[PDB]
Ligand binder design. Structure first.
Ligand code: FAD
Length: 257
């Protein structure tokens, strides 16, 4: 240890039997940029049992928040699902990640495309002042299999526009687009199918991707990333990085083990 900060679990909310969210304290010395991730976990036998976790809380918040998977035989999330108020976790002290504004060229639009727990880095980004100073529109798209998997669906639409520090920017600039595949819902299908059929652009009121105006952030499943990366690169969009900004950056929501 001592490369970690000890934080106390303050709140827990389970969404389904596979998806929960818990908030913790935040160390005064802990500083991070929106879209980054850290190594988060538990102290087991005096050794760090951690996995990669996007930071889902805003930088303006006095605390940290994590949007987590619950896997039955998973080394971390089998113990982590049984967290309670007062429990201790460890968080690494060196943030890292590709989902940075500076890896993207200046633009008029920012498309945050996520499936499942890939919403988590964008929960930090949409609750940041600077994204709304740099992009005219922020379109958040969240793809899930079931309606119950739409974590934070009421906080984004009902409570986030009411924010006394960020609300008017959310009302005017944030577009939220939830889609569900395997249950009846107002929107249906994969987000990749929605980009193909052109329905994504019909539903949000904005024109198709073009190399001048649209910048994109992708965080989701391996199938969704490779598929959408082919969509974007065959259209002429290039992948940015710290040393060479571009139009889209990508981050793995998980890796199949
Ligand atoms: C950059 C990065 C950021 C990440 N951010 C988050 C985050 O914010 N929240 C989070 O819950 N996980 C996140 N992950 C995934 C993280 O590794 C999982 O917490 C971890 O794999 C599951 O813990 P485990 O040890 O119990 O299971 P593991 O032994 O690591 O994996 C068990 C199984 O669960 C699957 N799995 C893992 N994570 C997910 C997921 N999110 N959705 C669906 N299936 C999954 C794996 O494919 C595997 O088959 C991130 C991964 C990376 C690389």
């Amino acid at each position: 240890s001592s490369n970690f900060n000890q934080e106390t679990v303050t709140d827990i909310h389970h969404w389904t039997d596979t998806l929960f969210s818990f908030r913790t304290t935040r160390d005064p010395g802990f500083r991070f940029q929106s879209g980054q991730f850290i190594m988060m976990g538990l102290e087991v036998n005096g050794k760090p049992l951690t996995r990669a976790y996007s930071i889902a809380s805003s930088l303006y918040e006095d605390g940290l928040e994590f949007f987590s998977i619950k896997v039955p035989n998973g080394p971390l999330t089998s113990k982590l699902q049984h967290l309670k108020k007062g429990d201790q976790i460890i968080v690494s002290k060196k943030p890292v990640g590709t989902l940075l504004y500076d890896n993207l060229k200046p633009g008029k639009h920012l498309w945050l495309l996520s499936t499942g727990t890939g919403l988590a880095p964008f929960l930090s980004i949409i609750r940041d002042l600077e994204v709304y100073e740099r992009f005219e529109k922020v379109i958040l798209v969240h793809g899930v299999r079931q309606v119950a998997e739409l974590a934070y669906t009421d906080f984004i639409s009902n409570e986030l526009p009411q924010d006394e520090f960020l609300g008017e920017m959310v009302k005017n600039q944030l577009i939220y687009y939830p889609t569900v595949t395997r249950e009846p819902y107002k929107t249906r299908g994969r987000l990749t199918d929605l980009i193909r059929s052109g329905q994504l652009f019909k539903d949000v009121g904005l024109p198709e991707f073009n190399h001048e105006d649209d910048r994109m952030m992708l965080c989701g499943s391996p199938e969704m990333l490779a598929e959408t990366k082919q969509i974007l690169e065959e259209r002429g969009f290039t992948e940015g990085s710290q040393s060479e900004p571009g139009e889209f950056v990508i981050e793995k929501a998980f890796v199949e083990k």
